[PDB]
Amino acid sequence: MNQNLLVTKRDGSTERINLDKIHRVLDWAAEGLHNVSISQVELRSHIQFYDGIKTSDIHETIIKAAADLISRDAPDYQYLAARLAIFHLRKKAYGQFEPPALYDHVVKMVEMGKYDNHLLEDYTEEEFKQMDTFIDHDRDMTFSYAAVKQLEGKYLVQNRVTGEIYESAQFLYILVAACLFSNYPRETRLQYVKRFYDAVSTFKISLPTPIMSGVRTPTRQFSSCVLIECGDSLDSINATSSAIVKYVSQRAGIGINAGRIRALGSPIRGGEAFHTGCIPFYKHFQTAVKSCSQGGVRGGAATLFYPMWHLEVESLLVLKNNRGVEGNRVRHMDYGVQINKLMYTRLLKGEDITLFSPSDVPGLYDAFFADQEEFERLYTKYEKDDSIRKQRVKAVELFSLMMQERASTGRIYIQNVDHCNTHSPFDPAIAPVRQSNLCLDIALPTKPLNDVNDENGEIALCTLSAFNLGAINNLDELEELAILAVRALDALLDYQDYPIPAAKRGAMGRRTLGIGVINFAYYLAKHGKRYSDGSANNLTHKTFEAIQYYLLKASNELAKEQGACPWFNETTYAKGILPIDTYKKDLDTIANEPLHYDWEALRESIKTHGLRNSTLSALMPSETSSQISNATNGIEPPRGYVSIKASKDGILRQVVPDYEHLHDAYELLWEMPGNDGYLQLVGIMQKFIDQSISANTNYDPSRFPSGKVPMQQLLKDLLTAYKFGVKTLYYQNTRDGA
C-alpha cells in the first residue's frame, strides 16, 4: 500500500521507482515520430521490471521494447529506439545528457590516453572553443537504431574490457575533421574542419571503419585492404608472405597476385624448387592470411588472382571445391580468374585454349595485361613452337569449369585484364593494372617485393570514401563534397603509418584514392527508375559523369595548391587522356545522355597542373557505413524492405529509406528478371570510374525450368559484362528471397 519497486543506481544503490521520469523520456524520444505507441512500449518493458533492478536495465529494456516494434508499417520505431539508446549512451559516457564542452572533453580524454595528445598541441583552447560552436549534438537524434548499434559497436571510443563508452558520435565527427585538417594554414583550417564536420555528420560523405574508429586516437593504422604481387621466386614468395602477415595483423583485406608462380613440373631455377607447383605456396599464403585469426580459420580474408591460361588452371579453379583430396584444396581464400579478349574469342569460335607456365613463354604475361596485339602475337607464336611445354583444353570446357565453380561457391571472380588496362588512369607500358583487391573494386599498379623491406617493390592500398546519393539534393552539391572528400583522404595518406616500405612507396608515389557511392538504389527509387528495364541508363550516366568530373576538378584544384603526386607522369591523365576518351564503345548504344560538364577545359587544366591523386573513384561495397547513414548498400538493390542483423542485444531490424512513399518505387533484388539491366548500369558507371566496381551477378532458380540455371545464361551474362566494358565481376548470389 506503498508497493514501490526499488531501482538501484550506479553504486548509489537503492531508490524508489520513477515511472513518470521514464514516460517523460519516452515522450521526448517520440517527438515528431508517426505511428509509435508509447503505451505499447511501456507495457512491453514495465512487465519485465523486478524489485531491485538497476537503472541501466530499465534503459536497455525500454530500448529493446522500442527496437522490437520496428516494422515496414511502423518504421519510426527505429528513431524512437535510437533516440532512447542515444540518451542512455549520453548518460553512460557523461553522467548527464548534455555533452561536456569539447575542450574539456578532449583534455580529459588525452589524460586518459584515449585521444592522441597532438590534438591539444595542434589546436588552442580558443580553437576548440570555436569548433564546439560548429558541433550540433541534436544531429545525434537522426541516427536509426541499427545506426546507433553500429556506432556503439564499432566506432565510438570505448573500453572493450569494462564496456565503458567514452564519447558521442558528434565528438567523433568533429575530431575526425580536426585530425585530418590539422596541418592546414590557420587561415583556412577551421573553415575546412566545419565544412567536413557538417558533411560527415549529415551523412553526405561516408568514411571507412578503421578511419572513423581511429583518427583522433593514438594509433596510426587505418588500412582496410592491400594489393601484393608475388614474383616467381622463393625470395618474393617469402616477402609476399611476410607482408601478408604484417597486414592481416592490422585487420586488412588482402588481394594477392600469384599468377607468375611457375607451374608444377617446371625446372628448378638453380635452387628454387617449384617442381611442386603453385598449390603448396597458395596453402602457405592462406596460412599467412589466417595467422592472426581466431581458430586458424575465423577472420582474415584474401583473394588470389591468376591468368586463365596458367598451366595449372584446371587444378586452381577447383581449389575451394569441398569434395576433394585435402592436399589439393586451398578452400578459405577466394580466387580471381584473369581473362582478356582472345580467351573469350576462343570460347565464341569453339576453339581451344592453350595453357602454359609463365616461366616458359617469354613476354606473354606482361603482354597479357599491357598490349593485346603483342599478347596475340606471342600467344599464337608459342602455340606453334613445339619446344614449349603446353596443354590444350577446349575453351568451352575451361569456361564452364570456371563458371561452374563460380556458381557453386559464389567466390570465383573474373577480371577482364584488357579492360583494366585499355580503360585506366595508368599507362600500361609503365604501370599496368594486373590484379584487383579482395572485393574486386580496386585496380592499381603493383611491383613484386624481393624482401619484406625491399624499397623497389610496390604495394597498392585502399584509400576510401563515399558520396551518399540519398543525402544530396542536386549533383552540383558534389563539387563541394568532392573537395572535402579528396582533401580529407589526401591528408590521411600523410597522416598514417606504413608497415612495409613498398606500401609507403605506392601511396606517396601515386596518392591513389577510391571514393564511390552508397544509397544508389534509394536514389533511383526517388527518381522513378528501376535497375532491370534500362530506365536508369541516362540518369546513371548523368550521375557518374558528375561524380567523376567534380572528383577530378577537386584533385586538379588540389595539385594547383600543393603539387601533383610524384608519379603523375605515369598516368594517362598526364598525357591528356580522359576516361571519356577510353571507355568501351558499345556503351554508346545503351545511353544517349550528353556530357553536361566542360571536360575539355579540365583536360587542359589536368595536362597543365596535373592531378594530386592518380585515381579518385572506385565503387566498393559497404555494409557498415551504409547502415550508419540508413542507406541502401553501395550500388546494390536491396534484398527486401526490412533487413535483419543478429546481436547480443536482440534482433536488429532496419527498414529501407522512405519505405512509406517508395515501396512501389524500389526494385528488390529478386524482382529483377535477370542481370542485363544491372550489368548495363555497371558498364555506364565504369565509363567514368578510375578503378573498378564490385559488381555481382544474381540468379534465382525459380526462374528456370527444373530449377537449374543454364550454363548458357551464365556465359551470356559473362559476355554481356565484357561487351559493356565491365572490368571485374564479384559475387554471384543464388536464391529467391535472400
Binding site: 574469342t345 565464341l348 569460335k349 564452364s400 561452374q404 559464389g410 559476355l719 536464391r735
Partner: peptide, 18 residues
C-alpha cells in the same frame, strides 16, 4: 549452392560480338 545444367551451345554464342 548453385545447381546448374551444363549444356552449352557454341552455335548460339558464335554470333556474339565482344
Amino acid at each position: 549452392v548453385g545447381q546448374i545444367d551444363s549444356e552449352v551451345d557454341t552455335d548460339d554464342l558464335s554470333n556474339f560480338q565482344l
